[PDB]
Every structure is written in C-alpha cells, then in structure tokens.
Design a protein around this ligand. Structure first.
Ligand code: O4C
Ligand code: O4C
Ligand code: CO
Ligand code: CO
Lengths: 385, 385
C-alpha cells in the first residue's frame, strides 16, 4: 500500500556529495575503483577560491567530492561576493564534519520540481533548516534540510551539473564504465529508529515501503513512485555478536549515512571489473558466502537464474534474495575509508516490469537468515569431514 | 668540497610520512599511480585505536600514510598505555596540520646509527625538539626535531618496518612496480632561505652541496656521503611571472615540503607506466617542453643519449640536464592533491661511478634557462609560420 502522500513533487536521486580532506585523491580512487568518469569540476582553475569540488558520473549516478581550501584564500569574500559554486559550503562546517566523522556523505541530493517550495513545505512540516534556498545564475535552485546526524537532504530544481562548474577536458576524462547506472537507495544509521522515521516521514510525506536477530531494526521511506528510497537502521542491543549498527555509531561519532546502493545494468560485469581492481587501488568486497549458500540458491531462485548464472554468482561472491514481486542480486564492499562506517552495495533487480518499479525484490533482508543457515551448514559439513 | 662535518652518523633516507584525512584513499591512489605495493599496516585490525597508518614500498622507497581515528576510541589511554604504533602521533597536531596545509609531508625520516644520540646532539646544536627519543619494543628508537614549517626531521635507528606494524596479506599486496627504487632528495619551501639553511646546517652538520631569474633562490644541504640531500628554496619577489615558491607558501599556509624526487632504475619504463594511468586514478605530469627543447638536446647530451633515447625522452616529456660529472633525466608531476603545493619528481642519474655518488648530475638547475630559451624559439618558429 502506497498512499502517495509526498508533500511536494520529488523526481529522482540527483547526486551524493562526499566531504573529504583532499577531494583530488578520493575522487581519483573512486573513479578507478567504481568505473566513473570525471565529468565536471569547480576549483581554483574555475575561479572557486573556497572549495575544490570534482564530479564523477556513471550513467545517471553522480558522486561529488568536495574539500576546503585554506580560508585565507577567500578572506576578503562575504556570502554576497562568494566564489564558491555551492553556496551552502562552509569551511568550519566541512572541517568539523570530516574531523568528527572522517570520510563520508554530507548530502543526499534529490531533484524536485521547485527547491524553494520543497524547502518551505519541509520546514513548515518539521524539517530542521540547514541552508536556505539559493538561486544560482537564475537557473538552478538549491536548498538543504537536516536528515540525520550531520547529513543533509539537498533539494535541487532546474528551470530548464551546476552553474560555476566546468565540464572536464576530454584528456583528463577517460571514459571508464563498469556498468553502474544510478543510485538505488541510500541508508542511514541512527541511535533511535522511531524518532528518525517520524521526523523524516513528517516533513517529506514519504511513506513506509513494505518489506518481505542480527544487529538491526530497519524501515524504508519512499517517495510517491518509490524511486527515492531512504532506509534507516537502528541497533538492537544485548545480542551475542555486537551490532554493526552500534559499531558504526561509535566509530562515526553518531548517526550518519551507512551505505549507498548503486544499481548496475550488468552486475556480473561490474563485479568482474571491480574485483580485478580491488588490490590495485579499487575497492575490496566482503568475504564470500560459503559454497553451501550457493548450493541452496537452486532451491530458491532456480526458476530465475540458470545453473550457469548461479555459478557465476558464486565466482563473484554475489548474494541473491527474492520478494513476492521480483528478484535481487547484491554484494557489499568493505568500508570505503579508514573507519568501519560507510560502505557501498552493488545491486541489480529482476522483475516488476510495467520500466521497472522501484524497490523491485526488496532490499535483501532475507539474506541475513540465509547467510546464518549457510554458514552453519558449511561448518557442519567440514566438521563432519 | 665536502668537509664531512655531520655531527652524528647518518645512513640513508628511511621513509616519508604523509599526514592525511583518510589514509586509505590516499594510499590506494598513490599505490596505483606510482606502482608501490602495500607492505605494512598499523590500524584497528592490529590493535591501534589511535591512528591508521599504511606503508607503501617500491625498492627502498617507503611512503607512510597516516590519519587519526576519532579520539573517543582511545579516550581511556595515556602515553604510557598508548596503542599508537607511532608514539609521536597526536590527534590535535594531525588535525591542525591537515586543516592548515592539506595533504602533505609531515616527516622526512632518515636512518641514523643512534636516534637518541642524534636527537641529543641535534638539540644541543640548536634543533627545536618535536618528539623525544622513544624506544619501541626494545628494538627501534624514534625521535623528531623541527625541520621547517610543520615538517619534522625524524631519526630512526635499529638495534639489529616498525614494531606494532603487521606485514600485509599477500592477497591485498599486489606486487606493483614501475621501476622506482629510492628517495633521491626532498625539497622544502621557506619564506627566508638564509635562516633556514643556518638552522638546519647548524644542528646537523650538513654541508652545502655544490651546484652547476625564475622565481627562486635555492641551496642544497647534504650528509657526509651526500646520500641524504635536502634542498631548500625561497621566493624571489618583484618578478614579472609570480614566484611558484610564493604561490606555494600562500596555498600551504607557510613553509613546507615542496617536492619529493624519486629515483627510478629505468625512467622510460616508469614514465610509460605512470602516464598510462594518469587519467585512470594516477598522477598527471607537467606540460611537455616544446619540440625545440628536444632538438636542442642533441647539441648538449648527444654524447650521452642516442637519437632514439632522445626521441624517447620527447615522447615521454622527459627533461635532461648535465653537470661536469654526470647527466640527469627528470620530470615533474602536477600537484599531488587539491592545493598547488607538493608535487613529485621522477629522476634517473647517469655517471659518477666509483656505486653511484649521490647528487650525480646536480638537480637540473640548468633546465630553467633551457626551458625559457626553448619556449621562446618554439613560439618564434610558429610565429614565423
Ligand atoms: C547491508 C546488507 C543489506 C542491505 O543492503 C539492506 C538491508 N535492509 N535494507 C533496507 C537494506 O538496504 C541486506 C542483506 C545483508 N546481509 N549480510 N550483510 C553482512 C555483510 C553484514 C549485510 O551487510 C547486508
Ligand atoms: C622543480 C624543478 C627542478 C628541481 O627539482 C630542483 C631545482 N633545484 N633543486 C635543488 C631541485 O631539486 C629543476 C628544474 C625545473 N625546471 N622547470 N620547472 C617548471 C615545471 C616550473 C620545475 O619545476 C623544475
Ligand atoms: Co541496501
Ligand atoms: Co628536484
């Protein structure tokens, strides 16, 4: 049941902004590791004396990497005379964010029909303001409200990347592509799920998205057409193995974005490409499930995936779960940086054709149980041996 | 003339430590871009609750990348009970360094016979102390004194990487190698050369190394066998084109390390490998000199390099200079990070065989003149056209 109760018109995920210490090195590492091309920049070479911002793209996926210059470079400036291309940026906030959380997501940006109205309605409905609506070059409006922790939800709307950004010279823009195409969902970790859900659903009108002992409780908020999907987790205390949600909050110094799920148009090719680069500057993946997990795949997805595709899932370490409507293939990277906080999910969904409906196949909640049972069977198999 | 006046026994460059915001992403980028393998780590997985440190190696070259965790993780600790593997590390200092300078070199480390005596003698001779001698696991002694700006000169001595570091698992250690073999020299930029030279030569006993209108004055300090080479630059003001040394001081917020020169055993192969990766996560190089520069190469190094090697220098953008004792091949990267501050030089020296004597061929000072004349001739050639 989707009551379609959005309080403003939301279109789709627009971009994700990382706040970095050095945006150059993070962006180059992500570009090689994820197969995203350098598409736009705003830095000293474009007249920005305030921050360095580099944009990577793959299909519709946009990752923005931003870091501050020395404040001394823009000492003469005031907000009305700023050279920053993102006027919500603030040296002090950026340094405090990164000092407090390390590398991670500052902004989850969604495209809306009218960012000014989205901001007004949001705050009228309980959102905590972060940056007021600002119109850039009479062409794009940006506004920001607090989402959770130090993460903001950013509204962007276009009259017809951003003004002040320059498209990147083809020589520096190598056309990497490993198959990633868009942001599927963006997941937050919070100390208390209930108040976080009430707050965000409160000011967006986003509804609970229906789903279907291991560290978390979660719920998913969704836009009208369910193409903007915002899951939120809380830890469950008093277990035997410590909650990874609690571990996150400790190392992140509080709530923040936990993982970004990136849709691939061919998850086999994405994972082959990413795995070739894991030890030469790219991203590492979580340890693969045991062969028992994959033997168990025939009995639950044998009608969707052939035996060859199931064994290709096994070679690549890919997980599979299924809804009543569709099938999901997924895998998780190790943490993106020094701290055991943010990671990335690669995902591809099968089914729910009408275009594919958002969230088709769920989010893989069933894989917590299947991973447990598969690890237990595998140990018993070898113990027997 | 080398008066061999070192005040303690200095062996060779040991390592260079970068202070980072996220050590994971900088280290992976450098590894791919320079062809250095992951060799050792000290982080949460080794019991270090204070900092993440990752060591890359190529031949004898050691790059250490370090970033702080949340101070909350080590709140219970005191220096006598620390889990840090580098006891001079300090959260506040590291955050201030990076906030002030961005990505750059915190420590130039040299191996000495006795780090405690090197520290005592240094301070007795004017060095400003930074971290007192500390003996690690009864096996290695580390001490630090101020060099210039927020850069320290670090002494390391071994009884027989560092205690508390673990060697890295072969799977995560891909044996990259593009030919780089050791640190040749490490160059500082300061506002006033005279007092910097007096200070450092004062407490080391290092002597001036003999050399042979464009932005700088420089001088080179050297150890007894001239294998530790520490050039220092100051800007020259009142020129037409602004001094790149002054630009550095402005964007770096004061003095600091300007470039690291990395010796290659085959600079042609290094530059081919590095240039293939420039647009896929590696390092970019300065714009190549015009063809006139390379036509002029025959008249000054035609006796050292064949016409094929000279045209291979041209394909790769390599510079050539020569002393009265040896020949030098060199090239410069664009800045390593967001700010126009630190960069890297790749170098290979021809001559002075006895082993090769340090500094053989100089540092390429003659290339400032040759680059000017070559750019002038090339423009006149095309202007004529
Ligand atoms: C992150 C994750 C998801 C996931 O992505 C979501 C779960 N709920 N929602 C809304 C989601 O987006 C699904 C199954 C998983 N199974 N095992 N693991 C281990 C490596 C610890 C997971 O991390 C894991
Ligand atoms: C850095 C550099 C050196 C160098 O490495 C040293 C010069 N003196 N000492 C002690 C050194 O180590 C030599 C010649 C150069 N010619 N042109 N350029 C332009 C790209 C701006 C240089 O940057 C350049
Ligand atoms: Co997910
Ligand atoms: Co040099």
């Amino acid at each position: 049941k989707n009551p379609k109760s959005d309080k403003f018109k939301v279109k789709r995920f627009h971009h994700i902004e990382f706040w970095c210490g050095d945006a150059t090195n993070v962006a180059r590492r992500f570009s090689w590791g994820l197969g995203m091309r350098f598409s736009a920049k705003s830095d000293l070479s474009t007249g920005n004396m305030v921050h360095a911002s580099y944009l990577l793209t793959s299909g519709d996926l946009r990752f923005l990497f931003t870091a501050p210059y020395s404040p001394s470079l823009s000492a003469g400036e005031i907000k009305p005379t700023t050279t920053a291309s993102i006027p919500s940026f603030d040296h002090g906030s950026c340094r405090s964010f990164f000092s407090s959380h390390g590398l991670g997501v500052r902004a989850v940006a969604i495209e809306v029909e009218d960012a000014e109205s989205a901001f007004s309605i949001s705050v009228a409905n309980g959102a905590i303001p972060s940056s007021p609506p600002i119109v850039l070059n009479e062409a794009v409006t940006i506004a920001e409200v607090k989402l959770y922790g130090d993460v903001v939800l950013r509204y962007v709307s276009y009259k017809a990347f951003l003004p002040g950004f320059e498209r990147v010279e083809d020589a520096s823009s190598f056309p990497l592509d490993y198959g990633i195409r868009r942001l599927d969902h963006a997941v937050g970790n919070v100390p208390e799920l209930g108040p976080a859900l009430t707050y965000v659903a409160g000011f967006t009108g986003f509804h609970q998205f229906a789903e279907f002992e291991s560290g978390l409780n979660s719920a998913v908020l969704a836009s009208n057409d369910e193409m903007v999907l915002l899951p939120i987790n809380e830890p469950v205390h008093g277990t035997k193995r410590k909650s990874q949600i609690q571990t996150y909050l400790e190392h992140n110094e509080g709530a923040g974005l936990q993982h970004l799920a990136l849709m691939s148009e061919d998850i086999f090719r994405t994972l082959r490409e990413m795995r070739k680069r894991s030890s030469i500057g790219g991203f590492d993946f979580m340890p693969s499930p045991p062969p028992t997990y994959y033997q168990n795949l025939k009995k639950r997805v044998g009608d969707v995936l052939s035996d060859d595709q199931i064994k290709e899932c096994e070679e690549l370490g890919i997980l599979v779960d299924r809804d009543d409507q569709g099938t999901l293939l997924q895998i998780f990277t190790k943490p993106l940086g020094d701290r055991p906080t943010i990671f990335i999910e690669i995902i591809q969904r099968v089914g729910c054709m009408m275009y594919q409906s958002g969230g088709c196949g769920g989010f893989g909640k069933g894989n917590f149980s299947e991973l447990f049972k598969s690890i237990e069977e595998y140990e018993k198999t070898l113990e027997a041996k």
